[PDB]
Ligand binder design. Structure first.
Ligand SMILES: *[C@](O)(C(=O)NCC1CC1)[C@H](C[C@@H]1CCNC1=O)NC(=O)[C@@H]1[C@@H]2[C@H](CN1C(=O)[C@@H](NC(=O)NC(C)(C)C)C(C)(C)C)C2(C)C
Ligand SMILES: *[C@](O)(C(=O)NCC1CC1)[C@H](C[C@@H]1CCNC1=O)NC(=O)[C@@H]1[C@@H]2[C@H](CN1C(=O)[C@@H](NC(=O)NC(C)(C)C)C(C)(C)C)C2(C)C
Lengths: 306, 306
């Protein structure tokens, strides 16, 4: 037993991180086969950041302007192209440590592991969720652009995030690995605000099921509720609407614990209306929303990865 | 910015995990050079667990009774010996992925990353602290024995924990990599209780400094306190005594933020005496004690590892 904010083992991604240096700018890139992916604002300078035209900026670049370092080994760039907000550097050497991989654009509410990197060297790994407002509450310092977020499924790394920027509220915005930002953000220093966030209701319910699996039941009650009546209380507390489709996803957890999804909604309703009154759930004094139903089942049943 | 419960990149350890199978028992082992380390109760059976004599049990074993699998490759055991509560299996092949490493026995209050494993395959990675009562609040299912905890320093993996067992309160107990249990625990199914835990005061103070570094200052106050007067309030709230030596460790954090260690103690005192009154710190509604002063400095300044 026990329940922890668990990240995927990071080794498969560690072997893909490289340093990309152009001009006075150094950041991380992701080396898969013979391509290095990195944020396109690596071609920017101290006065470019304000309103750069990256098409113009990139046509002025030569391959040899791109210094790619894989450890103590310098990769030669033999081509470059821009795809949305990512730069793709064709190099003469295919990464021999390239895992089986996919690029995936995730939905808000889904979680992933972030391998935080500086100068192509991993610093740490942690679990994030894509917030409903398409920010992530990460831990990112200057140097960390190009660090990627990912999930692993048996043996395949599904890359879903690459870090680009920090918003004035201390949260983070980035792209999928095809360079499309999550949310309305652009890689420009212009006024941008995160948008009002909301709590991921289906994930809170998953975590409540995690709690029950793990012996916390103080929050359960004999009541039930309708999905309509639940969503009328959720709206009030700035929780995402729960859909029948969320209900069906919570099925297996509902089945393992013997608590109907709608009964767990009645518990969450009372938790929203009364607070926790000085009690904790799974070592938290807040309702936790960065575990998906899949995360809970993974950790409470022990799925591995090769 | 941002602050997350960050684990070390796990790749260096992933390459060392193997499956050790003896009799009806399968668990994880740690393959470094030509030795596989694993919990000695791998030699136990369904009725051995009650009061086994592992010396007697092990002399009855042959090398060929030990099935060690490194992926799709079966390691041949050419010797075995018991060191405290760990078994050391000499194998004919040295792990080519053996990192630079050390075995270290940590002090309560220190943190580490746990690479949770089943059948020699990594499941996830998370950050733990050694509690003052020498348990760890982990996430461990059946199959997870032999998973290790570790820290990394530049390029060296310092192994400090190997998982053995779960206590009836849902917490976990294990050994260092030389087989010595942390705390009064034994690898026997006899009555054992964790001992009363306490909060790691110096770590809470570190995390408060993390908060200030990251823009949370609502909890600060103009007051100060003496170490004596602080420790009189700490005792009351079942916090560890703060020593002058803890104070000196908190120096660099005190210097970077401009808040004297004793002033942050006055803040913590008021937080203990008044609660947080519906406010959060670093996304927590509890005082967090599983970040060391070093953890905070690592994450707030961006140290990496090669
Ligand atoms: C990233 O480019 C990086 O790691 N680069 C290393 C090169 C500089 C040596 C950084 C990572 C952020 C820094 C702090 N936390 C981070 O996640 N990203 C940036 O520097 C981006 C790039 C220009 C500005 N920027 C920012 O994140 C900045 N925020 C910002 O301007 N945001 C709004 C929404 C436009 C207001 C800031 C944090 C440096 C002020 C790009 C956006 C092109
Ligand atoms: C470990 O041996 C393992 O992973 N083995 C895989 C082999 C069995 C297929 C497990 C890991 C624990 C199981 C659940 N969570 C865990 O961390 N450890 C054990 O099974 C140990 C070994 C015997 C009993 N045991 C326990 O953890 C048990 N606890 C217990 O008996 N504790 C007290 C303090 C003695 C009461 C229990 C959880 C299975 C009941 C050993 C202690 C020899």
């Amino acid at each position: 037993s026990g329940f922890r904010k668990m990240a995927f083992p990071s080794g498969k991604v560690e072997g893909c991180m490289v340093q990309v240096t152009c001009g006075t700018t150094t950041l991380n890139g992701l080396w898969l086969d013979d391509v290095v992916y990195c944020p396109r604002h690596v071609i920017c300078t101290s006065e470019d950041m304000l309103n750069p035209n990256y098409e113009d900026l990139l046509i002025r670049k030569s391959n040899h302007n791109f210094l790619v370092q894989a450890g103590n080994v310098q990769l030669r760039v033999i081509g470059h192209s821009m795809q949305n907000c990512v730069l793709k550097l064709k190099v003469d050497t295919a990464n021999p440590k390239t895992p089986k991989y996919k690029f995936v654009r995730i939905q808000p509410g889904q979680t992933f592991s972030v391998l935080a990197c500086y100068n192509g060297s991993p610093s740490g790994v942690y679990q994030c969720a894509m917030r409903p407002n398409f920010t992530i509450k990460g831990s990112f310092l200057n140097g960390s652009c190009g660090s990627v977020g990912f999930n692993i499924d048996y043996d395949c790394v599904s890359f879903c995030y690459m870090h680009h920027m920090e918003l004035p509220t201390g949260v983070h915005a980035g792209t999928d690995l095809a360079g499309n930002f999550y949310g309305p953000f652009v890689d420009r220093q212009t006024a941008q605000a995160a948008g009002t966030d909301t709590t991921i209701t289906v994930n809170v319910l998953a975590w409540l099921y995690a709690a029950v699996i793990n012996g916390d039941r103080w929050f359960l009650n004999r009541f039930t509720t309708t999905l309509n009546d639940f969503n009328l209380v959720a709206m009030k507390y700035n929780y995402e609407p729960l859909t029948q489709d969320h209900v069906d996803i919570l099925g297996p957890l509902s089945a393992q614990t013997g608590i109907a999804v709608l009964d767990m909604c009645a518990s969450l309703k009372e938790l929203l209306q009364n607070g926790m009154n000085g009690r904790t759930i799974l070592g938290s004094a807040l309702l936790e929303d960065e575990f998906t139903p899949f995360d809970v089942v993974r950790q409470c049943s022990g799925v591995t990865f090769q």
